Amino acid sequence: VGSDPVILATAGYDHTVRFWQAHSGICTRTVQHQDSQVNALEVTPDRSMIAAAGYQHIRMYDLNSNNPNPIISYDGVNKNIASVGFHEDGRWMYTGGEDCTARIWDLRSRNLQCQRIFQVNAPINCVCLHPNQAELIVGDQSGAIHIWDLKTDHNEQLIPEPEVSITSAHIDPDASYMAAVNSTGNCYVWNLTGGIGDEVTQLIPKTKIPAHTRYALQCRFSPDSTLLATCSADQTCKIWRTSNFSLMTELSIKSGNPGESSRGWMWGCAFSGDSQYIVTASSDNLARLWCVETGEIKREYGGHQKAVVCLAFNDSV
Template sequence: MSATGKIKAPRLSLINITAVGFNNSMRWMYTGGEDNSARIWDLRSRNLQCQRIFQVNTPVSCVCLHPNQVELFVGDQSGTIHLWDLRTDHNEQLLPERNMMIQSVDVNGIGTMLGALTHKGMFYTWTLKSVFNKPSRIYPKMKLEAHKTYALKCKFSPNSEFVVTTSADQTAKMWKSSDLNEVVTFTKPGQQWVWDCAFTSDSEFLFTCSSDSVVRLWRCDDGAPIHEYAGHQRAVTTIAFQDGRPKQDAEITAACNSPPPTTDIAVVVDDDVKS
């Protein structure tokens, strides 16, 4: 990390980064990119070092870390989900359906369910069973047409009771994770593509970001909009949220689609954003 808090990435890695995340101890970071790889980066050294590389055959579209901190789920544009066991480098593959790109993957907070969303709006879930010192066992559970148009993101609530999917159809939809029955739809005229979402830690509120340059806060029980955060000039495509300490305001950060004028960044979001 530099003094400004930015990660100095190697200049030779000038490829589109499609996923980024950190382990609980903040000792390492994982990324996925259009160079057909997922990577582990050591954050303990002053200069960012790539420790390990997991290579696939097509561009990586999404990556998610299991709560056990030792398994990564890697989705790619061929429609394959790879389970990468960081302890042994063992990997397994899931192919929900052919000719569908895996757009987003997520694991619920207790590590018992995997969800995956394809670009065609199909949402799949699997039951995860933990086995001591072995990769999680994966069992197909349910399949749902969550959206009829291009889908973008899936995210489980912190209490694991719900999952939200977002889409180009101008909606985010919340489903019960147990049976995938629809609970509520978050939508507002003119909000355009809904790119990303983030729950509050109590699972009672949801943030969304969309192509109309606005971040919105919604109430989860009835889908009512609470507040709008405006100010970006272009589509807001990524959002990260962290609850503040008790009696303090929550903090919200959103990244718009224009990358900063420097290569000292951890995430590059394409400038060519659809609406």
Template sequence: MTIDNLENDQIIFATGGYDHTIKLWQTHTGICNRTMQHAESQVNALEITPDKQLLAAASYQHIYMYDLASNNPNAIVNYEGTSKNVTSVGFQEDGKWMYSGGEDNRARIWDLRSKNNQCPKIFEVQAAINCVCLHPNQTELFVGDQNGIIYRWDLRTDNNEQLIPENDAMILDISISPDGYLMASVNNKGRCYIWSLISGTLDIPTKLIPKHKFEAHKRHALKFPHLHFRSLPLASVVECFHNLYPDNDHKSISHKTKKYCYHFFLYETTSSLLVTTSADQTAKIWNTADFSLLQELKQENQRWVWDAAFSADGQYVFTASSDGYAKLWNVKTGAMEREYAGHQKAVTALAFRDVS
């Protein structure tokens, strides 16, 4: 094994999609290192555990965990008990617990410590949950649902607070900057809302102060760096949504169809950037100082862009799109640097762990 490989082992880049596989990539060569099977459904979201040992895949009724250290193509842990699609998944920074949100209207806390003292927590809302985001203080979850409500769920007190940025718009994704000062959210109208967050000590809740609002995409979209968020554009998702369920019956959405995936990814950099992804076939990078458009990442026929993630220094951004490719873009130039080919169908989720 060469030094390159060792170095590369610390960088983890995983993609998953509709072809029922999860692939791990060598980032600088574009070679697929490993393919894991995700037989039962599409991949809704991917997340890597803080210790980089496991990869969590949110899917229909399950969250599967894959071992990143071995070559086992099958999942080694299966978290079950949710009745519908799990749309988002994430971890407490020490890996003590995992949070998830799904179309069964529930956000959950899964205790990852030893079996004996399991301490599950559940938070139920009125509509299917599209996104769950953990505040860097590790005790507050922000949950966005299809009714357009953002809930601040305090894990210590179980209190919650509601926020409706806009009527008749679904919350597609929420992202909070790693320093905990900014929160962004996008809705299905492609509109992006920004809040300043004021942290309280101990059990004093974080205050949200509306800061900015702008049209991110014509349809749906979003994602941030330093705050990194992402979202999907409204029009096309809604379009697709109506096509699949003409009666707009939310209950019927519980099938193995993934309508949309909008998750915000937060990530840390000294310059504040936000990336939003959209069904308008672009990913956009915004400067959070003035919310001006920095780059539009666009490629012919790349179709919907589902997910995005920044490198640790904010110089590069990965995107996943319906054309079956994951791509690496240079933030400064807006040029595509690498293409990761291998998926047979749309790539809908990615997880990236950089080393800085």
């Protein structure tokens, strides 16, 4: 399960976190995550252990050893832990909670509590890590984007759209852009300053895209720096090109009929190593493998009786 070249994870309300092989459609293994739905799913940079952010706990299951129960559980947090992220050295963990706190946990320490605490007023919707590993971008429901310096402890907040809740924020490998997405359905993209070495990293406004009519759940960059994807409540995930910020591809699960049910939402997406394909997690209890360029449906894995809120995709050598 951890010895396979492609680790593809899927989680949801059915109380299971399931591992797949991406080139087949056949379910590799199923792990029980009871009593909580999974808010976030992320695989560590060293591919040793996979982490799930649920309600009032963070449960870490072993990828290398097949079919265990969780190695590392982190409790003591009240209400949700919505978002998670990892350091490239595998030592530190970062979690956005609904406690209005972005936290830094020590994984190699036995301590049940957290090593560092950054609290804001509003519940924090997202946490993502700048490639230089010196800073943490933290979005919340107030509409504030907090840039948290992990060294100076200095924090700098930025409010492009006031009073509307930002949901997800991510940053590309080359650190040339920063994109954030909100409940409004707009997607904002800023240019980054290369003052990274002296701890400056200024943000310069570039584009604002009326991406979706309805809410926009997540926005995630392709490792190419070429493609910026945004998933939404409109049953659509749109892939944009970083050049013109024009629409390249539009993924649509829409009923093909005006009167059906709102068949459910596209919650998350993760780009493949070569940026040829894109993975999707939907409320229809399906994880789908799409062709980025063509738009065709390459694969479909249903694993679940209930909904799918999460995705984890890892290609590393």
